[PDB]
Amino acid sequence: KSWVGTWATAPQLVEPRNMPPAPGLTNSTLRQVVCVSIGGKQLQFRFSNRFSKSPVTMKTVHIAVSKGGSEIEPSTSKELTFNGQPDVTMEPGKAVISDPISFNLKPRMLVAITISFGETSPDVTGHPGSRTTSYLLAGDQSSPDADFSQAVKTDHWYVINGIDLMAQKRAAAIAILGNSITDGRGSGTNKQDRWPDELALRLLKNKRTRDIGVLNMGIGGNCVLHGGLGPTALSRFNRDILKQHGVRWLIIFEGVNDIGGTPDKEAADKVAQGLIAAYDKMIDEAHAKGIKVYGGTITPIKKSFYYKDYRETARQTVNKWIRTSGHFDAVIDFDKAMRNPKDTLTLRPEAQSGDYLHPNELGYRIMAGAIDLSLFKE
């Protein structure tokens, strides 16, 4: 057996507007909920301080089955350790991985991770677009019987980075690079129904693909080339994709924010060529590690705040390259799945959030339903 990722979230420097509310993380206890893909029996948990400039101390970390909301099944709670000890300090810019731990992890299990912090970094490493409520209490509230029913709610994740499990060679993971259309803006809070979540459900029910996990490395507002929110896709590619465990496929579905940021035709045409070059660079680097790469066509923007005629031209340039260049190992045509048959330059009205840019839950289900699962064999 060897490690295979079952859940991950892509880290960044948290912006002030997305910081934890009072009472803050220092000397407080934070309960967070994640939804895994594949199950297993022996796990490790990864925590990141990659974007913080001060050390961060976790006095204790516990894991348990979440019962919804902030509640847990207390008989399932276990403590993590880090070289035998319950407490660990992360160095500035670094991550830590727990000791391996036995836990009955079922497919699509909701896992509550409870961290009691000591001193923390005001530049926080986290993932603002969690689409999931986290719960904060002042003090050290690490007992499995602690009451969180009154905790301060925050719809962000902090510090947590991944869960991997030990599996046999038939087990593997898909890693997915994207923006908020992949991170799940428009999906239901606490409903774990981002399109990669909907893909995980389809894989788990298809007997042939039941041991294939899904690692959602979307970042809300992300760019491939420059600017945007969080580190660019090119900058984070090694950490967020190539260093994951057990990955045998990458889906690249990103670039709308690069196009959306352009002020004129000249700039938009340059971004289209830059995206194509960036796709080729990431395809090559993944291929050199034996990973197959599938390309997602960029979905419609007309009627959204991003629409301009010259931006639409760039989008079409990129999509024609995705569809026809042959450089991707296959094409996942999300544009074809999401576009209105009656007005192909706009999203299906009933499958979007009101902004004509982000799908809604139905749209994310349609997008996952358009993926041929035969792309993930062995």
Numbering used by the authors: 9 to 386
Question: Which lines from the publication concern this structure?
Answer:
Acetyl xylan esterases (AcXE) that target mono- or doubly acetylated Xylp are well characterized; however, the previously studied AcXE from Flavobacterium johnsoniae (FjoAcXE) was the first to remove the acetyl group from 2-O-MeGlcpA-3-O-acetyl-substituted Xylp units, yet structural characteristics of these enzymes remain unspecified. All homologs were confirmed to release acetate from 2-O-MeGlcpA-3-O-acetyl-substituted xylan, and the crystal structures point to key structural elements that might serve as defining features of this unclassified carbohydrate esterase family. Enzymes comprised two domains: N-terminal CBM domain and a C-terminal SGNH domain. In FjoAcXE and all studied homologs, the sequence motif around the catalytic serine is Gly-Asn-Ser-Ile (GNSI), which differs from other SGNH hydrolases.
Three crystal structures of AcXE from Prolixibacter bellariivorans (PbeAcXE) were also solved, including a native form (1.35 Å) and two complex structures, one with MeGlcpA-Xylp (to 1.26 Å) and another with acetate (1.13 Å). The sequence identity between the CspAcXE and PbeAcXE is 52.4%. Both comprise an N-terminal CBM-like domain consisting of three antiparallel β-sheets, and a C-terminal SGNH domain where the central β-sheet comprises five parallel β-strands flanked on both sides with α-helices. In both cases, the CBM-like and catalytic SGNH domains are tightly packed and connected through a loop of six to seven amino acids. The residues forming the CBM-like domains in PbeAcXE and CspAcXE are 1–175 and 1–176, respectively, whereas residues forming the SGNH domain in PbeAcXE and CspAcXE are 180–385 and 181–386, respectively. The first seven N-terminal residues of PbeAcXE and the first 10 residues of CspAcXE did not have electron density and so were not included in the final structures. The active site of PbeAcXE and CspAcXE is located at the C-terminal end of the central β-sheet of the SGNH domain, as is common for all α/β/α hydrolases. The Ser-Asp-His catalytic triad is formed by Ser188, Asp363, and His366 in PbeAcXE, and Ser189, Asp363, and His366 in CspAcXE. In PbeAcXE, the oxyanion hole that stabilized the oxyanion intermediate during catalysis is formed by the main chain amides of Ser188 and Gly228, and the amine side group of Asn265. The substrate-binding sites in PbeAcXE and CspAcXE are mainly shaped by five conserved loops, from which two belong to the CBM domain and three to the SGNH domain. As indicated by a structural similarity search against PDB using Dali, the structures of PbeAcXE and CspAcXE are most similar to structures of GDSL hydrolases of unknown specificity and some with esterase/lipase activity, i.e., TesA from E. coli and Pseudomonas aeruginosa.
